[PDB]
Amino acid sequence: TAVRGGNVLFSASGRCTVGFNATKGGTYYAIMEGRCVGGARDWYADAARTVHVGVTEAVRYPGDDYAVIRYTNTAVSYPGEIDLGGGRYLDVTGAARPVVGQSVCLPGATTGRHCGRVEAVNVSVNHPEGTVSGLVRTSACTEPGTAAGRPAVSGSTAVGLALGGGGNCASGGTTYLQPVLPALAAFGLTLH
Template sequence: MRRTTAIRTGLSAFLLLGSWATAGFAPASAAPSPANEAPASPGLLTAMQRDLGLTAGQARARLAAEKAATTVEAKARRAAGESYGGSWFTPNSGTLTVAVTSARTADAVRAAGAAVRLVEHNARQLDAAKKHIDALSAPPAGVSSWHVDPKANRVVVNVVATHKNDNNVREFLDRARQAGPVTVNETAQKPRTFAAGTVGGDPYYTGNVRCSIGFSVHGGFVTAGHCGQAGASVSGWDRSAIGNFQGSSFPDNDYAWVNVGSGWWTVPVVLGWGTVPDQLVRGSNEAPIGASICRSGSTTHWHCGTVLAKNETVNYSQGAVHQMTKTSVCAEGGDSGGSFLSGDQAQGVTSGGWGNCTSGGETWYQPINEILNRYGLALHTA
């Protein structure tokens, strides 16, 4: 691949020629952080302040609390056993709450460091109800998505308000309620994918579609499945060949991976697109519901919000996509496939949503660990 400059702002965060020294990068967060503070680049902190209304100190404190909650969640889940009903993080208090169906496990969960809420249904029962709904045929225009809400201890079905009285929507809801504990929520808009037509200067193309690169893996990168089918060729910002889609799934899932060659290398970093410093990727520990999360994409760059729901089925016009995570982060066309991070931990690749980064909206991502497991890939970390 020919280059005329060492670094180009529009180039993907992960496909750089040569080493750090060759590329001229000085990683913003290369030094280890204190054990009680999650490492974050100045750019990520700036984005959190802007999008979440925090001070710099509050952003650092929140990342540290979320990092601790991630560790607590794993211990508390083991302590709860079969009575585990889900968990969520509360930013104001900095605590992780774990729902349990048995008071006998409450003390063990508290000993793990979590607050406790007694509920009627455990996670296995809620997941079974959602799986039953997954098997139904949802009206493409009227039903937006559905997910398990551990705080409500129910499966929430999101219905587009203007279609709530449609006969096919009401029939779907009747069948959904037969699956178990279900509640209905009205939404203003329906999610869509965030691919875009060709726009010069952006990170990668397949055919006439432009998308964003997600995370480096050894041998390539992961991205959204709706951006290209297996075997499709991929070119970079300068239209030179990168590689091909080695695997792709959409709908049902929305993930893919692309191999790299022709002089393209991978590095464990997400660029700030020339406006904020870069963020190193150090792992893929899953953030809890309620945690802060930030997204990087080739169209709208850095934006932050919170994790709203997990294991949500999103009913796109092309078909349902399962096991998605919903966030309050905005996105726009061309951001598809881009990176979602919590602190320095990779979370997933941008799939779709509604709204924009002027008026706001919601965006879903496909969790990174599912993609890695599906294709037997190893995340490239710092």
């Protein structure tokens, strides 16, 4: 019936979490992590891959680390919200220009480290696919095995989407984010 930020989409790449829904000209889009989307085209709302919802429009990875999925199923809703679980939703109003020290939370993290702060901006990391620059380091941590694409917010303001991989949150693991503002700007998308 609906796909929100924080929900998982399924494809030939496996599972990837929607960071944020956005819109342009009455069309709806999902902003996702770039490495996770990989070389997949078709995205489904269910693990059975019976409810097709959209297609990969663009991948900005490496360099950046996000992808844009265009929703094509007009029978499903794509609200400008994050799913907090339990039928509760967070309305995302706009995006932040990340600044060191600001608070940031990962709705859904069950690590005890769901909320934290921006520790550094403009961080680079080398992946097998290439260098990724422009990343945010946070003190929050979500389980790295399911982290890819999870939304990070400050109140109702979108900060970024989590990169997958890295260390366990119990062993000093650090969650890095792809900031959302550059993606909105690059693709003309608005958080509705």
